[PDB]
Each structure stands twice: as C-alpha cells, then as structure tokens.
Curated annotation (Swiss-Prot):
Record key words, sorted: Acetylation, DNA replication, DNA-binding, Metal-binding, Nucleus, Phosphoprotein, Zinc, Zinc-finger
Residue positions where N-acetylserine is found in the record: 4
Localization (cell): Nucleus
Subunit: Component of the heterotrimeric canonical replication protein A complex (RPA). Interacts with POB3.
Cellular compartments per GO CC: chromosome, telomeric region; condensed nuclear chromosome; cytoplasm; cytosol; DNA replication factor A complex; nucleus
General function of this protein: As part of the replication protein A (RPA/RP-A), a single-stranded DNA-binding heterotrimeric complex, may play an essential role in DNA replication, recombination and repair. Binds and stabilizes single-stranded DNA intermediates, preventing complementary DNA reannealing and recruiting different proteins involved in DNA metabolism. Binds to single-stranded sequences participating in DNA replication in addition to those mediating transcriptional repression (URS1) and activation (CAR1). Stimulates the activity of a cognate strand exchange protein (SEP1).
Keyword Metal-binding among record annotations: yes
Entire protein: shown range: 1 to 132 of 621
Organism: Saccharomyces cerevisiae (strain ATCC 204508 / S288c)
Additional free-text comment from the UniProt record: Present with 4100 molecules/cell in log phase SD medium.
Post-translational modification: The N-terminus is blocked.
Name of the protein in its database record: Replication factor A protein 1
Amino acid sequence: GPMSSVQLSRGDFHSIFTNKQRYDNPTGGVYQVYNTRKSSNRENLIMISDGIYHMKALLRNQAASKFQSMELQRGDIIRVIIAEPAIVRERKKYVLLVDDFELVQSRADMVNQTSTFLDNYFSEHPNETL
C-alpha cells in the first residue's frame, strides 16, 4: 500500500551507545515520542522510542523552544538533526542530548508496543557500551 507506517530507526539507540562511528554522528534518527511527563523551561527531558528501546532525551536550545511551541506528545514522530550522546558512567545512565529536530508526523500509530528501557538493557550486559 502507499500509506504504510513511517519507519522508525529501529536499533539506533543500541547502535549510538555501542558503535563509535554512530556515537560520533548520532543524527538523522527517526523516533517516536514515548512519554512527556514533567518534573526547566529551557530544557525538556522526554522519553523517545526507536521501536525496540526507549531512552531519555534532553531537548535543549532550539529543540526545547520547538518542543514547547509544538506541544509534542506521545505518538508524535520526530527526526533528530543536532545531537550528541551522554554516558553518565557513575550512575549507568544514558541520555541523548538534542539541540534540534524536525516533525515527521503528529499523532502517528503506536500499536503492538514492546520497547524496553535502554538503561535496563545495558544493566543486563554491563561491558557492552563504549
């Protein structure tokens, strides 16, 4: 059919934190907003999904202004444009720092949901990350 669902970058979160090349350029990923629940007005911490894992993303600078103005919510699909990963070694926490993104689709289908938290996957395989 022409109207197939928009494809998320499945496996990209795992690749960002295991592969040096992807870590160094973690842009172009297509993800779905998983959770937007509140606590900063110049920084929005949200949960995003790649279809397999969900992970924390901290929207800063123009991504923060855009998120707030667009009122992005669970189910919305975005494309990350400016980003850098963050590994909090002392707490075994993983965050994608997002400075810019684009809206791909608002209110997209979110069915047969099986994504698990990225940090928990790495807890099960401790020496896997970079």
